Amino acid sequence: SIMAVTFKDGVILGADSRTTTGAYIANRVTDKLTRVHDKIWCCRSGSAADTQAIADIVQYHLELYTSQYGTPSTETAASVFKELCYENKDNLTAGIIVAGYDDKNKGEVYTIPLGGSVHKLPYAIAGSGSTFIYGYCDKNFRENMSKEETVDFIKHSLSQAIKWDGSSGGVIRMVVLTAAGVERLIFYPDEYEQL
């Protein structure tokens, strides 16, 4: 269960921490939020191997971009992801949400489903557990929310996704992307379950 949400001051990425091999939880404290640039992060869903391989290549491409042309746009990061996902669609099972903060463009969210298509959205949800919160998220999402409001929206949203989806669980990790910098938040079962 992964989501990225744009708010007034930037963007917030949210994810669960559960990795499954069948019905066995291989890792119950997984970090599904991965840095491709200082203020461009992504959420990974699908094959753990495929998404890591893609994320590792994109981080390389943007590092080399930065050396030559300076800080890349969130749109640019999304395009590199798309290029890998679209051209290798026959061999890849990767659903990636790209989220980043510019000063010019502020908070931006791009979702890349299996096909390798790109969609720019105010907020995005993906993963097995996302199906259970389409109704909730649509009813409860507003534009230009506060940081506290947006953290609550993601916490409540993933709380429900984790509750109903067996493949989702553990802790809720979040990454806040604003002008202020990069903040990592963690929320434990005892907190989010009683919501």
Binding site: K32, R44, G46, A48, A49
Partner: peptide, 4 residues
Amino acid sequence: XAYX
């Protein structure tokens, strides 16, 4: 395999 490992696979949200």
